[PDB]
Write a protein that binds this DNA or RNA. Structure first.
Ligand SMILES: [Mg+2]
Ligand SMILES: [Mg+2]
Ligand SMILES: [Mg+2]
Ligand SMILES: [Mg+2]
Ligand SMILES: [Mg+2]
Ligand SMILES: [Mg+2]
Lengths: 175, 138, 199, 190
RNA sequence: CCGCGGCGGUGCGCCGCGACCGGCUCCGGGACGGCUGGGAAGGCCCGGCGGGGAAGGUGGCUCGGCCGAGUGUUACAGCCCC
RNA sequence: ACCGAACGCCGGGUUAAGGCGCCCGAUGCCGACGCUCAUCAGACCCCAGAAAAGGUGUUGGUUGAUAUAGACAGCAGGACGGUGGCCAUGGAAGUCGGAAUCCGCUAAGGAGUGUGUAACAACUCACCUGCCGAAUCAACUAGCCCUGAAAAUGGAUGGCGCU
RNA sequence: CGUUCAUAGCGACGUCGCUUUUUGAUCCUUCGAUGUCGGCUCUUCCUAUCAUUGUGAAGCAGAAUUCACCAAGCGUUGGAU
RNA sequence: GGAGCCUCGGUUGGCCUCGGAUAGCCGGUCCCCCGCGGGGUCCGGUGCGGAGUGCCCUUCGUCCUGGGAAACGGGGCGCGGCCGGAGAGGCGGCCGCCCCCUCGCCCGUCACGCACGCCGUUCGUGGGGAACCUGGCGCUAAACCAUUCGUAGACGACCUGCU
């Protein structure tokens, strides 16, 4: 796995039928990935671990992108992880605040790279669950839960440093 | 010593982006560095938008932090923000700057001719004022 | 046809980078008030870093070996020299365009002088970060003429304050003049704000 | 992480009048002025209330080491106010097992000669920081009094005479001598 | 010899254009399909049904001129949200 | 000798592996999100350099607590008796050591954390209040940074530099 | 161990390192030759600091001291075999 | 003032506050203090900066005549006096007198090789350097050798002496 910005995918698949097992059970997952191609691969990786079931032994039935049903709501997402350290493998519960699951998992993948130099292929996302104002354990999230939120944008450092590469005016950063 | 604030209901002028040169109300703050934003009257769809691109006006129209777009449309049209914005000195010197860009070659020539004269008149009147100021000093 | 850049408030290498490319494209540049250049990283940090550079000498005959210039102008010149192909003819030609000064002397003390905002400290550094004035640095590594350069610049700032006061005085009269005249420049002043100035 | 906002208040008393040119508090009252600059602390020194009753210090989007300054600015203004009103009085008692550290102030407070420390021929001359004024007290035998408005300057000048009187190349557990700060009080209590 | 008529090869030297084809790299327009026969949205509003933040509210306190502003509590809907 | 790619002589196009402050072709993107300041910073296969073990440096986790029966620290009040308990006498009545190791009063104090004593004494280390006024605290874990970290001509993230 | 006290100074059983002023491994370079030990003489560097400056430690009362830090500026000699 | 080799780059100017950045810019002070200014308070304006380098200044065909608005401005490398400028000043400013002109903005009114579609045009330029013809006012050599000396010396060099 690598990235870009992910998309939730639904992928349901089954170990393909036999004489002995005529109508085998379907297994569904939530597989975040940049595209269906790697989605299906990612589906197979997770299933292999859990169930005696390989890409040869099975058929993916329905892979399909899943759309955030409330895009223009701001939400808080709890996300449970399973990363690999340099040392042992771990569990976490991260929390992000975003407009989407995909966005919230994407956000996670960047954080984990930042905070733990953890690369995609090490991380397992288990559950991603949207959450209330309460049931938010992280204070970095909790500070934005407030009705009359109010802050300034204090030392507003400029970009467009090469529109006028040279100029008479020393700039301004108070607004 | 701050005067403008990322408040809910603050109107912000978008400096750049897809929606560059458009007003936009801050519906809700998502993050350290991202605001859920709307500009119903100003042709800007409800979307998250980073602060880096928005620079914020002196207009806080009052609605509740996650109303459903209809209500901000009312609070915009009640306050008549489009009228008030175009009245501002800021928006005038935006309008100016655009009209300087639109300038055609004949229009550029007219201007030069108009300035050539208009700066001559003033220049003399300044010189007269200096002589009068020198006469007062004497 | 010539850049004059007030090196105050800039960052040593950050400015030097930009100056090099200007200089390589045939732009004649002047860099003024070089003592005011300021280098990221806390003072002590940079002193050691210089003091190390001092240690570098050709053991058998120091007289040959890397000439450690003290003056902030020459320091800044040294760092710009490090970003040109200065062993070439074209590189040597490039430096000959660049003209550096501790403080701001008589041709350029009555010239408006630019500021590279992409090399500027207020922009490029976090406000909680520490930095050093290349003056102080120069002073402690052996620069002789800090105080002289200060005493000459107090004159200049006093001399300039006067010029500005007279400039202001004209601007003010000019603002008055327009108001005195604004019925016999009215259908000029109108046309200069249809095509979008004066607003 | 970046805390969306922090602040504090510094309730100035009705005797004192504080004023802030930007981020450069100047506090004046009974005893005198005390300016202090905080260009280097990065905060919003608002000043609010009719009768100018309280000094507020916001600090937006602070991380842990940036939010550590908020209180230390607030506190420095508190001391500044105390200095203006009451004024600081550090008292320091001389200690010896033999050679009775002979102290004598000179110009006004400025100088402090400290003769016969440990039977040394060297006479320590110690200047005071501008503002602070040493004076040899009465009602207590071996004891100095440093008074002044700017606490920083006082306590520094106290240290100056404390480290002056130091013992070299001896067992300092055995040799307990010198002029040590005994008490950090005020010129007037109210 | 004048025709620079018709055809053929050419130009002393330096130039430019034009249209045709090949191979590229860009730009601007438009018209369609499929999906959770897309998801969200908008607009009109009506009838209900609850839950939450937290309110034209009330209340302790504070700050300004009964009104405006800032915290705090129980929480219906006369701000909204689900 | 690595990675990319294998050469007739040339024009246009496009790539690879690598890059794009300046040297040096290309980010002079209004690039996105974090992390990190180092008086030895760090900066890219082969490769030209460090470990065990530490650090309330800062940032994340994990697990457990705690507390309105208003805590947590911060100061103030007591720390006993059954009892020279038993083994050990060389002295251990809590205290070089070790088997023990409970009851009373209890508000509550271990047959005792230490200081110190030949041995005591004396001192010191729960349970509870008084004040103050919301979170507090422990143990792990892993990121960057730091200690650990000493070589001889002056010196090398390639250089200049860079926060 | 240090009367007592793991850590002032030490430090077993274990363990992790650096160094190339020891000696080995090794044989890449030089066999149409790179003059093979020591001493003298002279310069320069390193620090893993004996002394000297400034300091923290002690089982530092003083004196004498070992332990450590900044640190290589300046020194570090005359002889008998 | 005339020719005449050569070396090239250029192809409007900008004649300036200080500085700040969790702030600044301008006014005006009714009022107060200092040396027309400087400092203060108070109030009024600006502040994604229009007293803006996203800027300003300047115009880019020539002439003619015959109206209007604007109108004493410009010139003669016009001429004399009084300044300011030393950091590498190298540039300005301000004052007398002589002669000449009517230039910016609109309109009328004609004409200028109109070189017959086609390239280095257009300036800084009286440029930098070398060699050559005119006027006015100025000038009137040192150096080195040789010789000498000995504060010096391998030799050069150096210190000295010589109507
Ligand atoms: Mg001693
Ligand atoms: Mg023992
Ligand atoms: Mg060998
Ligand atoms: Mg040899
Ligand atoms: Mg050492
Ligand atoms: Mg030309």
């Amino acid at each position: 796995k690598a990235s870009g910005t992910l998309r939730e995918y639904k992928v349901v698949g089954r170990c393909l039928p036999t004489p002995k097992c005529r109508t085998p059970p379907l297994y569904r997952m939530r597989i975040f990935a940049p595209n269906h191609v790697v989605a299906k691969s990612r589906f197979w990786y997770f299933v292999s671990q859990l169930k005696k079931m390989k890409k040869s032994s099975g058929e993916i039935v329905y892979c399909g992108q899943v759309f955030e049903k409330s895009p223009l709501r701001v939400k808080n997402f709890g996300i449970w992880l399973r990363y690999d350290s340099r040392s042992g493998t771990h569990n976490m519960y991260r929390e992000y605040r975003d407009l989407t699951t995909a966005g919230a998992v994407t956000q996670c993948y960047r954080d984990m790279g930042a905070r733990h130099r953890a690369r995609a292929h090490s991380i397992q996302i288990m559950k991603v669950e949207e959450i209330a104002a309460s049931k938010c354990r992280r204070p970095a999230v909790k500070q934005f839960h407030d009705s009359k939120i109010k802050f300034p944008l204090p030392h507003r450092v400029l970009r467009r440093q090469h529109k006028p590469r040279f100029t008479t005016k020393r700039p301004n950063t108070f607004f | 010593v701050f005067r403008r604030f990322v408040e809910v209901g603050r109107v912000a002028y978008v400096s750049f982006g897809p929606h560059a040169g458009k007003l936009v109300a801050i519906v809700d703050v998502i993050d350290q560095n991202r605001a859920l934003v709307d500009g119903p009257c100003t042709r800007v769809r409800r979307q998250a938008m980073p602060f880096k691109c928005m620079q914020l006006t002196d207009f806080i129209l009052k609605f509740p932090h996650s109303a459903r777009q209809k209500y901000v449309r009312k609070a915009w049209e009640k306050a008549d923000i489009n009228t008030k914005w175009a009245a501002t000195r800021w928006a005038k010197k935006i309008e100016a700057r655009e009209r300087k860009a639109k300038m055609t070659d004949f229009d550029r020539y007219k201007v030069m001719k108009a300035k050539k004269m208009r700066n001559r008149i003033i220049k003399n009147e300044v010189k007269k004022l200096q002589r009068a100021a020198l006469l007062k000093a004497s | 046809q010539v850049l004059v850049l007030d090196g105050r408030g800039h960052l040593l290498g950050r400015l030097a980078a930009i100056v090099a490319k200007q200089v390589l494209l045939g732009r004649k540049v002047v860099v003024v008030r070089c003592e005011g250049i300021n280098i990221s990283g806390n003072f002590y940090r940079n002193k050691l870093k210089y003091l190390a550079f001092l240690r570098k000498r050709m053991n058998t005959n120091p007289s040959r070996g890397p000439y450690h210039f003290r003056a902030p102008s020459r320091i800044f010149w040294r760092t710009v020299r490090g970003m040109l192909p200065h062993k070439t003819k074209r590189g040597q030609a490039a430096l000959d365009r660049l003209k550096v000064f501790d403080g701001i002397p008589p041709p350029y003390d009555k010239k408006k002088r630019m500021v590279v905002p992409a090399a500027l400290k207020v922009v490029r550094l976090k406000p909680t970060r520490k930095f050093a004035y290349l003056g102080r640095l120069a002073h402690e590594v052996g620069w002789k003429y800090q105080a002289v350069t200060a005493t000459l610049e107090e004159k200049r700032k006093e001399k300039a304050k006067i010029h500005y006061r007279k400039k202001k005085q004209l601007m003010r009269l000019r603002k008055q003049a327009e108001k005195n005249v604004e019925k016999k420049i009215d259908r000029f002043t109108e046309v200069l704000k249809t095509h979008g100035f004066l607003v | 992480m970046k805390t969306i906002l922090s602040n504090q208040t510094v309730d100035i008393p009705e005797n004192v009048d504080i004023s802030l040119k930007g981020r450069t508090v100047i506090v004046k009252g009974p005893r005198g002025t005390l300016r202090r600059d905080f260009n280097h602390i990065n905060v919003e020194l608002s000043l609010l209330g009719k009768k100018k009753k309280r000094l507020r210090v916001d600090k937006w989007w602070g991380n842990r080491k940036e939010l550590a300054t908020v209180r230390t600015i607030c506190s420095h203004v508190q001391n500044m106010i105390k200095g203006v009103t009451l004024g600081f009085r550090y008292k320091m008692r001389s200690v010896y097992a033999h050679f009775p550290i002979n102290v004598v102030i000179q110009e006004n407070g400025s100088l402090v000669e400290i003769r016969n420390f440990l039977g040394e021929k060297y006479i320590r001359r110690v200047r005071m920081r501008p503002g602070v004024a040493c004076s040899v007290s009465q009602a207590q035998k071996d004891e100095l009094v440093l008074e002044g408005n700017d606490i920083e300057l006082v306590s520094n000048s106290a240290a100056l005479i404390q480290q002056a009187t130091t013992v070299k190349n001896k067992d300092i557990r055995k040799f307990l001598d010198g002029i040590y700060v005994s008490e950090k009080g005020t010129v007037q209590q109210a």
